[PDB]
Amino acid sequence: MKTQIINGVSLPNIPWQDKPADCKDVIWRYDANPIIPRDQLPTSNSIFNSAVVPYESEKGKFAGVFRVDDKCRNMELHAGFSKDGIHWDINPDRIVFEQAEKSTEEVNQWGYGYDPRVCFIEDRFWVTWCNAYGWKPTIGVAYTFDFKTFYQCENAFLPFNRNGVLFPRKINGKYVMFSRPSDSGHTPFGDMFISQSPDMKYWGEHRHVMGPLRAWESKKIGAGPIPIETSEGWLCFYHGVLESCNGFVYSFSACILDKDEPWKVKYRCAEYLLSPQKIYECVGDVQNVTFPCATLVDADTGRIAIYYGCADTCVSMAFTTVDDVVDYVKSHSSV
Amino acid sequence: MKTQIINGVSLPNIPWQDKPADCKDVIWRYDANPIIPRDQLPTSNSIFNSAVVPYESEKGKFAGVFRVDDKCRNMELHAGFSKDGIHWDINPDRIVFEQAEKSTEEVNQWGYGYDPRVCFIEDRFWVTWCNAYGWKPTIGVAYTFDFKTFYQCENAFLPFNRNGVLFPRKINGKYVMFSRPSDSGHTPFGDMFISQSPDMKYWGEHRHVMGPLRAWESKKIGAGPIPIETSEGWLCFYHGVLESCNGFVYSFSACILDKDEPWKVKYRCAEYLLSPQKIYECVGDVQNVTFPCATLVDADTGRIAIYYGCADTCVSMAFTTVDDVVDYVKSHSSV
Amino acid sequence: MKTQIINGVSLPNIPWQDKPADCKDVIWRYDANPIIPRDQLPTSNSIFNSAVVPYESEKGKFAGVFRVDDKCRNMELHAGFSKDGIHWDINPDRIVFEQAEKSTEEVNQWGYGYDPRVCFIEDRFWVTWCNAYGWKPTIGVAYTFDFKTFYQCENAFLPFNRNGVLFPRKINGKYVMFSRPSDSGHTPFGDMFISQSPDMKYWGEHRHVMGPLRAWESKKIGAGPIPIETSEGWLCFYHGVLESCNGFVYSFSACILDKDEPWKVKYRCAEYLLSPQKIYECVGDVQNVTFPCATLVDADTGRIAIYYGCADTCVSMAFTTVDDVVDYVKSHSSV
Amino acid sequence: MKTQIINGVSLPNIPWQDKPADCKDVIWRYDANPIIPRDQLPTSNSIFNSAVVPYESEKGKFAGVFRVDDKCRNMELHAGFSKDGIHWDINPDRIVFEQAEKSTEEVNQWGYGYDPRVCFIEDRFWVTWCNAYGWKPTIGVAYTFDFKTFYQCENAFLPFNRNGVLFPRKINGKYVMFSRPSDSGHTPFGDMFISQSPDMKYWGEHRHVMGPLRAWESKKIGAGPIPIETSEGWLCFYHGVLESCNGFVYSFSACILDKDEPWKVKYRCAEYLLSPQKIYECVGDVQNVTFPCATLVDADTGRIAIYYGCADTCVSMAFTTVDDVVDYVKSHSSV
Amino acid sequence: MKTQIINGVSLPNIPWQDKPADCKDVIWRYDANPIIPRDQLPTSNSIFNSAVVPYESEKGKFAGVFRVDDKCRNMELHAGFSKDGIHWDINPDRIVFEQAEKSTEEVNQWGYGYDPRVCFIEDRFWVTWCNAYGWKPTIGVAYTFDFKTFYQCENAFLPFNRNGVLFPRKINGKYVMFSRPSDSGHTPFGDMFISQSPDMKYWGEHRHVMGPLRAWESKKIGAGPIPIETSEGWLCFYHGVLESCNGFVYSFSACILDKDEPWKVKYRCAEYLLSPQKIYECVGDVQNVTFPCATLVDADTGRIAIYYGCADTCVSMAFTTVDDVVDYVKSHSSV
Amino acid sequence: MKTQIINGVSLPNIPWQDKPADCKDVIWRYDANPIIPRDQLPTSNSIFNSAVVPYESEKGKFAGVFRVDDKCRNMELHAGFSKDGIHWDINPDRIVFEQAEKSTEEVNQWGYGYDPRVCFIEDRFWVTWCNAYGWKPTIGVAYTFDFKTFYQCENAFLPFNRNGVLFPRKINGKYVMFSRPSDSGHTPFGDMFISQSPDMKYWGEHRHVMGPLRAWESKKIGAGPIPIETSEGWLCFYHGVLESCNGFVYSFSACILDKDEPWKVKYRCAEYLLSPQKIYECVGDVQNVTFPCATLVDADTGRIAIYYGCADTCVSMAFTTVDDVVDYVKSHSSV
Numbered sequence A, B, C, D, E, F: 001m002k003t004q005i006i007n008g009v010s011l012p013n014i015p016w017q018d019k020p021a022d023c024k025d026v027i028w029r030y031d032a033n034p035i036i037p038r039d040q041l042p043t044s045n046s047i048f049n050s051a052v053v054p055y056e057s058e059k060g061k062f063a064g065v066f067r068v069d070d071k072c073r074n075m076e077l078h079a080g081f082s083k084d085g086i087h088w089d090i091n092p093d094r095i096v097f098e099q100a101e102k103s104t105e106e107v108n109q110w111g112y113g114y115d116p117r118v119c120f121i122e123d124r125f126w127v128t129w130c131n132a133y134g135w136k137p138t139i140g141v142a143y144t145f146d147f148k149t150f151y152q153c154e155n156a157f158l159p160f161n162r163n164g165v166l167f168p169r170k171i172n173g174k175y176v177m178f179s180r181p182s183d184s185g186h187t188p189f190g191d192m193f194i195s196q197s198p199d200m201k202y203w204g205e206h207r208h209v210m211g212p213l214r215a216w217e218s219k220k221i222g223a224g225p226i227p228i229e230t231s232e233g234w235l236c237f238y239h240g241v242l243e244s245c246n247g248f249v250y251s252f253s254a255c256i257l258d259k260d261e262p263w264k265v266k267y268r269c270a271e272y273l274l275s276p277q278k279i280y281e282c283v284g285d286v287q288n289v290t291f292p293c294a295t296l297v298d299a300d301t302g303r304i305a306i307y308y309g310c311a312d313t314c315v316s317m318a319f320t321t322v323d324d325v326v327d328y329v330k331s332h333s334s335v
């Protein structure tokens, strides 16, 4: 493989299907989508925009935190487990958080939570999500060792903010997190930023990554799954929004960020790599949405399995390789 | 049966299908929806949000008033009949109202009409609908003995108003009507109210029923079909709207209102009972709409046949029981 | 006088100032405006848009109900008294209503109230105002014999409604009230309607009077002071709004409506008769507002003294005559 | 045939399917829609709203200019060719214009272009489209002799403008073009106008054709394909928009305009003739869109083949006849 | 003088006041503003944004076209005359246009007209203004020899357009006009364009001049008075808009444009040269407006007398020199 | 005095005027307002919302940081000095920041800055203001020893944020700062928050203080001047906004916050203490604004001098005492 995967994991059991010969795209879709239907739970209205990592437990080889919207249309997080990454056993009830320190007992009352991102850092799995603080969106922060008990920390930022995503290691001695300053509704703007922290409590040294650019991402953008570390830099899949007369179209693509100053863009794919086109992507609670919150990467082979929300209704899977993505991103770069 | 139907009728021939073994919901859909397609009439663009009652005539055992939008997209009402309550003979031409009294000849010039509700009271059938007065929406009123000739009365209210639904009898010697103060557009608010009238012409004693509460009903709510009198109070199905970045999503559920002062809420289901999920509910003239304007109730058995509009395009049917709905409403009550 | 005053009152002591010789307008302003400053009460932020009638008491020859906004910006009504109609003794505290019947003790909790209109009808003074029902604007109704105790009745209409103004007698055996369907905000539309009532409780036979027409009144209109009965019909001063790039401009003019069917417009002045031009009219809490809620009329001379709110800040006075206004209205009529 | 085709062409080889016997519409769809799928080009996100004419080349009997949006969602024009007018060979790369005159070399830099209309006039083919002048929409103008090389002329108008459509010959010695004054976004309005030019460069004598009228066309309208000269006058299909709570619905119909002064409406169909009802019309990048930019007409038989964008995603075809459309328009005429 | 005036006139009688000693601005106000108050005519609500040129008549040495809004708030044009350029005799009644050619007899129905600009070209005075065509704003065109009879020509453009201003001679054989593409309301955008015409009827070769830039002009810009020819090129005062939370703030400044291609900016002043600061500029019908539609220039000395609308209420005057404006524009230039 | 000032300073020379006998308000205005006119600098368009502290230098006994908007309407910070705190010597040119550490040389390029707040903490003066990061509003931080050289630090937060105000000492060993999450425009919402930092670089432990509550403050609130430490807790003046049909009205009041956890409100005045009422508060660049950013407090007497911006045009002064404000806050407390 041309590009190397750095600080990765060997994943011979990664969910995978080979690219079809007729496929002329960088990314191809699993052929039995969705992998998680809207009604997998007795209480679920929809299940989408969800987080997935390798994890060995008694219930399989992968664990996750899943956004579940229930039949009240409350937004919640559920832990799940899978043997193959495709058929998922999702907890019937929501994650109920324990506070990590007593100092957040008063502040961190549960209201809602959605679009989780999860990555392993040094000794535990960190979770970020869009968390309500006084019914305002901000980035909630927690950790888990086992995906059974979850320990909530301080919200990283003031409202209004969404799409908080952690880099999977420290950079120049600090935790680094993507976020995306928003407003109190269906935000008509959005640039990606990073913020930095020595301790995962206090945040600062905020840095602008990039804003809307090409037509398919003209309205707003945000981070998607965990950044993937490569010899080229951080490979970061992100969503971008086009506004039609009838609303938003959510597609996603990738960029490559500088390894040590990840707010500096090296490459940025001018085209989307996947866009809402299939019936489960176009029809549903929110039409025309393909929204990636996790990927698995087999460092041995460069194989990527992408988890993405479809029409805010279900979870689907798509496939590609690091080499394919990096080559396309570099040869089809914006600015 | 646990909950008793009051002032009901015996409907052994109620359209009905049993609840599928796999169905884990309170309400289940007819397995051959829609029962009335957008194009059933030579002139119709769409047929939805419609009123049905038991009524014996030369053309069947049920009758109704149907919302038919033509190929000008004008909004009209057509009378209709059916032997089984599923396969419908809808008049090709619109209802042309006669004035009940000569003193409304000037005022009640036809503009448009939609979303009728119909119920028998003491000696005739009363029809309410969203009626244009000077091209502004208010609640039209009419009566019929035979669903052949319709006699229009005074509009009950000033604009702007919609979702006017009559209680099926007098309460404390007064006619009682659900309505829903609106605006001149696609109203971004909506609470349910009742108004009262001794003579069906002059209205007063307005009482606030309830407003938007849970997420699925957070933007606006409105009355649906005719209230059902039970031993628990008035069982009222109603619609509720959630607003996404792309538009409105219309679901429905139910509440129980006090017998004597129906504006007082006893129970209110925190969850929707049916939401737009099938292709014919999510795809059409207006995406993601499931909008109930009528139910048939078999007082003997407690079986319910619900008629609801789908995507503002067609009419579908769904089934449940009084006991099942009452149980769920009470066990999952809001406030 | 060419036009007669019908069912009027002899008012030789009417506040009055002769037309300045340089004045070329139909209506002319009192030369010492405002007659009531924003800070006349210790608690008042502003006092405007208020109702005034003749009334013999211990504190004068005139009484009224005054909109007073306090230093919380709460909207309230205060009774007031005056010897001359110009210098007012306004109660420091709000009217706290008694319910006329116990059946409204639950429903009529006090939220806010503003823009009162008052007229004598047969045996008492009736008051209408924009009354909050569940924090939504509608028309409150009350009566008083002495401006010391006020007895509140049922809100006449559902929300959202404002500018409810009573005709000062029954017409065709019914009470008749101007109102003006609105929305939940700074309403960007508005037509005048009337509704009718046998008993001041239940309302119906809603009739459209007129909507926005000339430029100065292009955005919305509404009833101003009590209708004045005249041998030409009902002389009705009303307000009209023009919308600039910077907000609203409130002017007022007059129309003449049919004596027997008051929703039928006979004449309607194409020009405004007064608009925001003085510093106390253009500067204050709400710029560019001249808003009439009361006139005094001397039936003997046809002299009219007009009370109007200025910039939602103070109350001012203007003068004109029935003959002057009627002639100008007739010679400069729209449709 | 009852209505004669004037200055038309003989097209025995026009794409054609007969009207099915069950069919109760003026216009029936091709039974294997869409005829050009979204993914026919390796780089295409969507292909829709396209222009087509008879033209004999080495690659077929028809040629065209196609709107292609790429995987950047850039909006572009591609030349295309076809033997049967149904299966299309579309150039993989965009048209790169050459300037007709040196004087536009600085001015006409390529930004974007979409929704072309093309007709032969006198000695060449004229192309109009919505062209970006400094990223503002106006009407681009070009000609071609061979659909290989395209020569760009002056933008006909100032922004903001769209739906520029040439009449297929001079009228009273002047070129005449439909356009449609717009704004900088998803325009919430739109009336049809014509403009006139002695020389295809300077434009004037602007005349208002018509504006929004019936419910299906109540938000805005705009020209569709090239006007068809007939014995009744100019037969012009146009699109009309209805606004629902979730967005826009594009349908199309026809009007007949005066032969000598085409801004004068002679007949205008009150109903649409085709609206979004099929899955490929209702689901796609922009839901609920049927948008015509081209028709073929066989003057020998009166047969019409219509090309129309579906859901801004694909190109579809429909059929009708001149006599059928004309007859329906006349018998169902607006004003 | 340092900058020469080209093709100017000798105006020793130009209205004038020397710059006060304490003044630190490039432009200083006349010390008895306004020169035309809102009520100068018996029917006027306001008089502002008006056009002025040298012209010898029986009524003085200056003539003008004045925007007069009446007490209907109709927008009109009145011709006027002055001996000194400061005190004005304005016609009581509106200009009633005569059609230059029979061909515009049907098109040009009077609706409204505002903000005229006027200049002499070769043999007559040309008048442009914002003219209603079917109640939509575009640029009206007329000429006059004596300011008594006014001959209307074709509207130069389609709606929606405003701020049409002619250059006072042909450039490269063509008439050249500023305009400013707008929308159907209080336009939240605006770039200056020019358009060119061989004959004052057909327009083409549209070029972008410039758009909003600095903070004071960040919302929108538009041409002001007639361009002034200098040895530096075309000296052009334009207005610019800042949007606060309460509305728009209209100031004006100046740019210098290329003599041969006036759409090319040579210099543009980063600061405004005048903004709303006096009581008569900040208070009135539209707050915070200083809007220039005319200047007089004495070519012999470089003195400029600026006429400008204040608060859309009255007409004021300000003074400056060509050398001062030029020096300041060049030394404080944007881009 | 009844309420003790804690950690205050002796300030015998505080600017002061006694309360007029006729004054019935808690706060009275300086009798020669404004103390700083809009045109005090040769380049200033307006000077308002400004910061002031006791500081002995060669130019006086008080120093400050002033918001100056220039004739470009750029927003800037200028240093200034006063002998008496009323008459000010304001530096003609903006503050050009030096970076505290080299590591912000790249990020902290100057865009704009406004509404500074300044307080002395342990050994230096700290300055917060609304600072542009990539032309988006956030909170800038800097410090100074002499008000001659200013050292910029890291922006405390991500956009979008405004009204950053430091508490004047550490609390539980952490810096505490008010802020107010905003959006990209004229924010139509706003709650007060605090954030905490061990080092003035990294921020976290965000706590919600309070949101809009009373009518005068119904649209949004934000912190005003530096908190004052008293025996009741933290006396904090703050601004709140009412939205009328013509825009915003900015008033201010005071609340009392818990000593140890200042996000917990102890008292909150229901009324405003000062609102726009004078000509210089109601007329100017932004009508109806009274906006406090600094107070001087004489601990020996409890006299308070308040600096506040008027109509975003000038700086004014007002007077009150700690005892007067605290007593009124407690006895007129909200929740």
Ligand SMILES: OC[C@H]1O[C@@H](O[C@H]2[C@H](O)[C@H](O)[C@H](O)O[C@@H]2CO)[C@@H](O)[C@@H](O)[C@@H]1O
Pocket: C244, C245, E049, E114, E115, E162, E163, E185, E186, E187, E286, E289, E291, E309, E312
């Ligand atoms: O907004 C005042 C300035 O704007 C422009 O025109 C107005 C016009 O007076 C009228 O209000 C119309 O309805 O709307 C326009 C505002 O959009 C300017 O060209 C000028 O007239 C005004 O100073």
